[PDB]
Amino acid sequence: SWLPIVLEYSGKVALALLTLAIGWWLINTLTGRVGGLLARRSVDRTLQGFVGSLVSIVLKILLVVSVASMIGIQTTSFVAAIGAAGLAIGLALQGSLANFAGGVLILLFRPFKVGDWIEAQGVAGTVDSILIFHTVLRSGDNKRIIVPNGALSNGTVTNYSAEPVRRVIFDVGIDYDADLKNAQNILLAMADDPRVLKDPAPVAVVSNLGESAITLSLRVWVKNADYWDVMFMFNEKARDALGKEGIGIPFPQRVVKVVQ
Template sequence: MNWMTLLVRIGIFLIILLIGFLLGPATRNVIEKMARNAQDKGVYTFMGSMASNSIKLIAFIIALSSIGVDTTVLVGAFSALGVGLSLALKNNMANVAGGMQILLTRPFKVGDYISVAGTQQMYEGTCTAIEIMYTSLVTYDNTMIIVPNSTLIENVVTNYSDKPYRRMVITIPVALQTDTALACREFAAVASAVPNVLTAPAVSCILNGYNADGTAAVLKLYAYATFDNYWNVLYGINNAIQVRRKELGIDQPQTSVRITEPVQPESADDNQK
């Protein structure tokens, strides 16, 4: 083999690699663009990531074949290497299997707000992508969290976006001298008037125990409160209740301290008088 032939083969090798490493990400971008109007974008992001890595691997094998490497031996070597890597990188393989399980069972999808009970801390945020190895979450303060897919499969996941209707329980402390029947009636009325609060089932208000300082009125209600407007609904209810309690003059519980002067015992001289 002369130098000219060698240079040509090396050039072909590099061109094939370049094509593969350009075509892989381009294919991924095309697949992800198809997901813009899709309801479940996680499938497309997973497929895009898988397609990109597969094209790069195929391009690498074809490039090696172009410089005279026996691909049969190469495939066998990759198979043996794959077994070894599977044992060495079992956690990574668990992440791949976890990603596939997420896509098949769909406990959540891209765009849902979820929380994950990790082994050491809680992770929560809006799901922005489901990749081969991990899932990306963006928190309320715009921080990116990368969670391994195996963590999502092995731990409890709470999906706050799955149900559009949420149950809310709001505790309102009131003083002991409060007319509790009037307070509960008024609190339930103002809460029912807040936008997105459901009238069926009706808003209920009960008393939850007593202590030395006061008692607590507990509102129980259902509201149309997706994650995007949950806090707006909750803050609206709290504000309406506070305005009404000020109008009615309902006080907060206050700790009362009673100070009494000890009675002095009568002396013998006083008794003689």
Template sequence: MKAQLQTAVESLIEKLEGWFTTTVEMIPNLLLAILVMIVAYFTAKYVRKFVTKIASKKISQDSISIIIGKVAAIAVVAAGLFLALGILDLGKTLTSLLAGAGVVGLAVGLALQGTLSNTFAGLVLSFKKKIEIGHWVETMGFSGEVIDINLKDFTLKEADNNMVIIPNRTILENPLKNYSLTTKMRVMLECGVGYESDLEKVEQLTKQTIANNFDQVKDPNNVEFYYTEFGGSSINYLCRFWIDAENALEKLKSKSRAIIEIKKAYDKEGINIPFPIRTLQFDSNLSVENADKFQEEFSNN
């Protein structure tokens, strides 16, 4: 028993000594492998910037240039990893990893169906010329400037400076309004004037006011003006005109400016913009005696 124990201890010591010797011998290779990975990491950062810059000169979509830069960086890191494994003489390990990648990839693909669908949707969005970084879009109740299109999500910056992150798949599956695809937008303004107003004068004054304050209009005849209804307290109209704008914020500013200038013009000409009022009329036949008589008849019944 004592001899067997001594043999086991000697065998263990021999193995530990072998491992120690191997570790000491591998230290230079290990340090070199770590150095290779560090160099690959920093090289990947510069490669990403360089490739993105070169791609942006050839491709108009910024999102595609960014993705190409990221792919180039990943390729550099992967090359560094393979080189480091080769230095450590882990070629067989690398082969085993590649052999098992197919099975693992299938399992991961089934588990990450949503993530993969967003990835492919991100690729599709990146190659869409009608959706680019810097465009002002509206989708699913959110409106803002496209800040980023990556392989996971779609980022909007709203007018109030809040960021909205939307999955790529959702963008592809839902309608999207892109304000930046055209350089013109139509401003629609609804208002009402009093029943005592000269309607022809109101129309002429409104058109002239819009033409005087918007260089894009110039001619009053380019302003559309339609009376729409006899309202409860005013005669209502719809005024429409085109402006040079590429986002909803410019359109909103133009509408605000038009309201201010029209109000000034109406005040100067004495044109009334009425607000809803209620008139209470008491018939002369209603008197205290009639009220008492009605109350007496009601009590008898």
């Protein structure tokens, strides 16, 4: 009779050919649709060829392996090769996917916003736009910096604009023979500007004793937007006011014993 085995193989062959035809058609329509949507978004044509071709050839390889195994053929070696190639392609993508994950994290927890002056990854500047792949900064000189979001979200970020109040300190070296109480009193009667907060009242201390000058440090609290104005005003009035009561700002002193 030999009829049951003939129909048992014929059903397998018919199902394999049906799968082949339907899958080929579906892959063709899908790649055509992807190419159309990529052309509509006005991307460069170099970046469309090996996207359409990539998708088509990958899906066609998968389908051909599947149907070849469906008729009668052993394809364990080809499945192993496909797995190796897929793992290679996956490992060759870790940087970009890490950037996208870091961008998602930056959008979820908000360490900084647009307009903030931040400093991270060895650069600094004002946040101009946050995307999911990178962040854009404008430098102090108004040059554009692009920072990827992966390393950005996996490192430390200093945000200069997050707090409403900041602490301008100061630093000035004075003579060694000056009397320090009078000097810090002079420095304290220099923060009477109507921009220095009184909330944590100002302070004037003697920090380290340097090699040529004694270092005094003023310490005041201002609003986050008055930082640099107050710093520059100090930079000028400091000398102009210390020199009045006989306190100089000295040069690099030296003691020389001359043997002739």
